[PDB]
Amino acid sequence: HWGYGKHNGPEHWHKDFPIAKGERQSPVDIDTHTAKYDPSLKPLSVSYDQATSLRILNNGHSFKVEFDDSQDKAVLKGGPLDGTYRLTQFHFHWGSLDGQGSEHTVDKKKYAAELHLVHWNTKYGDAGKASQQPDGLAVLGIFLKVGSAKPGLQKVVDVLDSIKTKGKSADFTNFDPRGLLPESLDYWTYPGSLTTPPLNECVTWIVLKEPISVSSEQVLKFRKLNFNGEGEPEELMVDNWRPAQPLKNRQIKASFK
Ligand SMILES: NS(=O)(=O)c1c(F)c(F)cc(F)c1NC1CCCCCCC1
Numbered sequence: 001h002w003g004y005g006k007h008n009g010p011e012h013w014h015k016d017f018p019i020a021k022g023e024r025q026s027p028v029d030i031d032t033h034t035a036k037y038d039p040s041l042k043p044l045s046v047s048y049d050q051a052t053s054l055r056i057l058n059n060g061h062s063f064k065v066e067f068d069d070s071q072d073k074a075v076l077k078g079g080p081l082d083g084t085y086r087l088t089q090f091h092f093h094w095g096s097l098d099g100q101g102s103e104h105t106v107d108k109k110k111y112a113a114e115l116h117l118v119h120w121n122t123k124y125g126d127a128g129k130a131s132q133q134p135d136g137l138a139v140l141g142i143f144l145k146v147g148s149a150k151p152g153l154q155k156v157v158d159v160l161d162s163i164k165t166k167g168k169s170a171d172f173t174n175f176d177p178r179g180l181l182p183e184s185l186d187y188w189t190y191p192g193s194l195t196t197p198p199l200n201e202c203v204t205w206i207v208l209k210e211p212i213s214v215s216s217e218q219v220l221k222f223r224k225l226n227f228n229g230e231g232e233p234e235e236l237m238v239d240n241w242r243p244a245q246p247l248k249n250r251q252i253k254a255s256f257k
């Protein structure tokens with residue numbers, strides 16, 4: 001099936017998902033100097049105080065933390081967004097070395113990892129339905145650079161040994177996603193897509209300017225995960241990122257300057 005390898009990775013996806021060569025594909029290189037400040041962007045509101053994490057799982061492509069999105073908790077609103085978007089999961093993409101791993105790039109810079117907090121437009125009632133619509137999802141993307149540790153990430157890192165292989169999961173309650181946010185909410189925004197199959201062009205990307213710092217020990221724990229299931233041939237879960245795609249006719253806006 002699809003994956004991140006030589007024979008099934010990003011260059012191959014368009015065969016099963018022709019939208020791979022579409023007009024709004026993600027990620028992209030963000031040129032910080034041609035990003036257009038947009039005064040009509042409203043203040044960005046990240047309201048995570050009532051977030052309810054449920055479970056963490058290894059799906060064979062990454063790991064994800066699932067939230068209870070059945071109520072009006074953990075919402076993103078404002079910025080470029082119309083209406084209210086509810087948090088449903090977060091996940092990461094990372095590299096086999098610190099010099100790569102992010103999907104978005106900033107003036108060509110690759111970060112060691114990228115965090116995606118995935119929200120769905122409450123007009124659509126759930127995340128699956130939302131993903132079929134052009135305005136269906138908003139993804140808050142945060143870069144991870146290697147340096148000092150992120151204490152708020154440690155709960156995640158410390159359970160990863162329990163979900164090493166595809167199809168493992170564990171209960172994962174009371175994880176506070178506020179602990180993964182940098183100080184600044186300055187951001188870039190552009191219209192795009194899922195970065196994995198089916199590559200739907202349903203995402204309003206919101207990419208924060210300020211990375212978070214994580215430690216080498218934290219990122220090393222990501223790299224001990226496996227794409228395979230237990231009892232199958234070992235393949236380390238590393239380099240699960242799609243490279244930058246053409247911007248085409250789109251404009252990237254900035255919330256600042
Ligand atoms: N990359 S993304 O663009 O934020 C994203 C979404 F917005 C989403 F709605 C659903 C998605 F599957 C993804 N990508 C995967 C990426 C990693 C392997 C599997 C874990 C789930 C997330």
Ligand SMILES: [Zn+2]
Nearest residue numbers: 091093116195
């Ligand atoms: Zn992602």
